């Protein structure tokens, strides 16, 4: 009907259709703390929200009131819960509510309540037809919105919409190969579809990642993904990777490559590798290089790794 900023907006205490119910003031006690000096409009809406809540009035007027309460503070989970109780009791059109939550999230995308409300609606409707496109629009504004990605994973997994997500991942990595949220989605998609046990898939992923690394040597996300898809089996289980990284050291070096070498040596020593002494010495030299020159911010960590290696091998 009328928004909080509309020129014809009227305070609830002045609305004739609300005269039959007394507003319920918030009781902060005689000597309040962290007391918020609310604007007149804010207090007005909440004095009436408190009245309808206390009265558990499942009405259309109460339903419209929650919209104003939400605009005043979209983080008020109590209002959101009551609004959902009303959607149910009043048998409100859920597609209309979806259009509402769509506009709300667009305005305030970094908020837990709005995304949960949308999930509940999708669950009630069992209709995910608008999700991937809507989420894509949110991500087009902030490619790393955590709630957006989380909601995306839920929808995809709950309604089995895996078919085009890898293509989506590839497009976003093209726009920003440093987007860690996208590399995460990549792992999410592959592990839940083909899995990484298929050696053809793993090879494709390793090649893809190595190519991204050559293009942007200092992008940590690609390095982390490379380790991520090989760590469970053990980095030392991939002998060719060590050689390839070794050849790049002189040129495409970096603390990421050096650290990866240490991770490989660590696993090698853990698996009774040949030339144990030689590997240990190489690993310790690299730990020192990292701690003293190439990754000094992590000196304590690298010193610890050096000592751990000696205590174990």
């Amino acid at each position: 009907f009328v928004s909080l900023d509309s020129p014809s907006y009227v305070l609830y205490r002045d609305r004739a259709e609300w005269a039959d119910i007394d507003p319920v003031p918030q009781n902060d006690g005689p000597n309040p703390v962290v007391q918020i000096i609310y604007s007149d409009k804010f207090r007005d809406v909440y004095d009436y929200f408190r009245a309808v809540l206390q009265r558990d009035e499942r009405s259309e007027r109460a339903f419209k009131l929650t919209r104003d309460a939400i605009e005043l503070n979209a983080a008020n989970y109590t209002v959101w819960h009551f609004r959902r109780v009303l959607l149910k009791s009043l048998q409100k059109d859920l597609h209309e509510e979806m259009n509402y939550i769509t506009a709300i999230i667009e305005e305030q995308p970094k908020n837990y309540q709005v995304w949960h409300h949308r999930r509940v609606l999708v669950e009630w409707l069992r209709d995910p037809s608008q999700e991937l496109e809507f989420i894509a629009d949110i991500l087009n504004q902030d490619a790393k919105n955590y709630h957006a990605w989380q909601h995306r994973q839920w929808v995809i997994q709950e309604f089995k919409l895996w078919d085009n997500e890898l293509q989506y991942v590839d497009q976003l990595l093209k726009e920003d190969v440093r987007n860690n949220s996208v590399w995460n989605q990549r792992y999410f998609v592959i592990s839940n579809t083909t899995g990484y046990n298929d050696r053809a898939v793993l090879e494709r992923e390793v090649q893809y990642t190595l190519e991204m690394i050559k293009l942007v040597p200092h992008n940590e996300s690609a390095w982390n993904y490379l380790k991520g898809i090989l760590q469970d089996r053990g980095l030392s289980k991939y002998p060719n990777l060590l050689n390839q990284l070794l050849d790049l050291q002189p040129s495409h070096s970096s603390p990421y490559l050096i650290a990866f070498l240490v991770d490989i040596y660590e696993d090698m020593l853990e698996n009774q590798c040949d030339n144990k002494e030689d590997i240990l010495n190489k690993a310790l030299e690299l730990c020192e290089i990292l701690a003293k020159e190439k990754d000094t911010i992590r000196k304590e960590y690298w010193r610890y790794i050096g000592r751990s290696l000696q205590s174990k091998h």
């Binding site: 503070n73 989970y77 109590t78 837990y112 940590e220 751990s308």
Partner: protein, 407 residues
């Protein structure tokens, strides 16, 4: 000389820690470079050639800002009308860290207010009359424990609190944040924190929880909000702290977690980012750096012979430099990064993180590294609960004398 203290961030070699974008620009590198340029300007403002004055924590300014916020706030805080117990906690904990006494009157007033926020169904809501929610419940309990008086302790309706937690427990081990609410690792931590402090943990309350949390650790080594999601310092702190309380840390791959969190400290800024390839932020001084004392304890419990007996596994000095030089608002209060406005949340976590960076403690070993003037030394904070260790002991001791509700 005592009047000059060399800084890690001011070393000439530190310039080599600047971002190398490989000549490939993306939104990520552009934003990172912008932050670094601003931070370098700030760093340089504390250096006068070979003269480097000791850094100063503006205690008095922070105190006055905090003292004022504890009583009243402008309508600018209407956005936090559903998180008032958080304001109480952030402010009280900051004052506690600054070793600023809490007047008896103020203490009793806070108690009365939190009592008004407590729901008859158990737990606390964001304000009087609001439904209970695990976030403000966690904050309310921490605030009451910081006050630490029998009056504060007894405000908590333990019988209803346990029933409330039961009402949020899911069969897969997770917890809802509130009735009909969302689920993510924050709930497990909020529940474990309040339940352990108030001694209301039952054998079945956290059945399956440790396993659910472990499922949240991902390929990165860190922990995400729910299984499958990106590792974030916030959810990682919640996950590990909850597991420590449950004595199930071993359910995680501590090696990948350790490597992940240490990688979150920014080589140039000195502070921590919340997730890979995102920006440095003062509040992660706690969420991220706080994971190191937790990891230290976990590894120490397993008999790790390589653990340090004097330092946490992150650059303690660099973090203190970032906080002291880049996160203090001249008018009092702390913040995310230069250019951002102060708020109680960042004031609480920047200070919490500074305290962790200043104090190392393991077994009988204690080693302090207080950068700047000695007055910068803050009171210690417990890595699990983030309230004074003295407050944790006093509260747990008090509640341990009470039975678990309905056994």
């Amino acid at each position: 000389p005592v009047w000059s203290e060399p800084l890690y961030s001011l070393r000439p070699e530190h310039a080599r820690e600047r971002l190398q974008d490989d000549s490939v620009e993306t939104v990520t590198s552009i934003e990172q470079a912008k932050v670094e340029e601003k931070i370098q300007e700030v760093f340089s403002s504390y250096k006068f050639n070979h003269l480097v004055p000791r850094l100063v924590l503006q205690r008095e300014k922070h105190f006055h800002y905090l003292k004022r916020g504890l009583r009243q706030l402008t309508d600018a805080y209407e956005c936090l009308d559903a998180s008032r117990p958080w304001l109480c906690y952030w402010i009280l904990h900051s004052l506690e860290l600054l070793d600023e006494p809490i007047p008896q009157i103020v203490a009793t007033d806070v108690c009365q207010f939190l009592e008004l926020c407590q729901s008859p169904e158990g737990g606390f809501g964001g304000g009087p009359g609001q439904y209970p929610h695990l976030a403000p419940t966690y904050a309310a309990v921490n605030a009451l424990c910081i006050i630490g008086t029998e009056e504060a302790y007894d405000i908590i309706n333990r019988e209803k609190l346990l029933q409330y937690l039961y009402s949020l427990k899911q069969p897969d081990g997770s917890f809802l944040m509130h009735v009909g609410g969302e689920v993510d690792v924050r709930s497990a931590y909020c529940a474990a924190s309040v339940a352990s402090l108030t001694n209301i943990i039952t054998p079945d309350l956290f059945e399956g929880t440790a396993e659910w949390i472990a499922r949240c650790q991902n390929w990165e080594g860190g922990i995400g909000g729910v299984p499958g999601m990106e590792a974030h310092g916030g959810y990682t702190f919640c996950g590990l702290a909850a597991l420590v309380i449950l004595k199930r840390e071993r359910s995680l791959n501590l090696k990948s977690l350790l490597q992940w969190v240490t990688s979150r400290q920014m080589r140039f800024e000195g502070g921590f980012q919340g997730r890979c390839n995102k920006l440095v932020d003062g509040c992660y001084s706690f969420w991220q750096a706080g994971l190191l004392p937790l990891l230290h304890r976990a590894l120490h419990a397993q008999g790790d012979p390589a653990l340090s007996m004097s330092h946490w596994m992150f650059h303690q000095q660099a973090l203190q430099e970032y906080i002291l030089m880049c996160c203090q608002c001249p008018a009092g209060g702390l913040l995310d990064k230069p250019g951002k406005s102060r708020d109680f949340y960042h004031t609480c976590y920047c200070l919490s993180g500074l305290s962790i960076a200043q104090h190392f403690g393991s077994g009988a070993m204690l080693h302090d590294v207080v950068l700047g003037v000695p007055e910068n030394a803050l009171q210690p904070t417990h890595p699990v609960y983030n309230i004074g260790p003295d407050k944790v002991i006093q509260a747990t001791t008090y509640f341990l004398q009470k039975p678990v509700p309905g056994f």
